[PDB]
Amino acid sequence: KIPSIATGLVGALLLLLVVALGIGLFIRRRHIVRKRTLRRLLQERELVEPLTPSGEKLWS
Amino acid sequence: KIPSIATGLVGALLLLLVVALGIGLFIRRRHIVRKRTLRRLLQERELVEPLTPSGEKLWS
């Protein structure tokens, strides 16, 4: 009566669409309520750390 | 010959399992290669910002 190929796609595509829409909209809404200090520090603390002598030549 | 209720579950459950396993193991492996400076700063820059007078009473 009905194809077994569409019965599986509808289940996964519909389940994936609902989960992606909910979880996607749930996390996408947190980016607007979050601060940009973790991004300004995300790339800053990643490989941009300060490394200078504060007391090696003038201090023993 | 076969139930249309299981044909959908197998598609979504199998697709969700493969996507969750791959994406899950893909992100879970990044936590071990990532630094804890974004977590030490995640809760530090969240609501733990410094606010003290550096020049208000002794400076005009």
Nearest to A42 by CA among B47, B44, B37: B37
CB atoms within 10 A of CB B13: 14
Q: Among 6.10.250.2930, 1.10.630.10, 3.20.20.330, 1.10.3720.10, what is the CATH number of B1-60? A: 6.10.250.2930
Q: Name the CA radius of gyration of chain A, rounded.
A: 25
Q: Which token pair is A52?
A: 């200078």
The experimental method, as deposited, was NMR
Contact B45, A38 (CB under 8 A): yes
Q: Does B23 touch chain A (CB under 8 A)?
A: no
Residues of B in contact with A16 (CB under 8 A): 12, 15-16, 19
CA distance A4 to chain B (A): 7
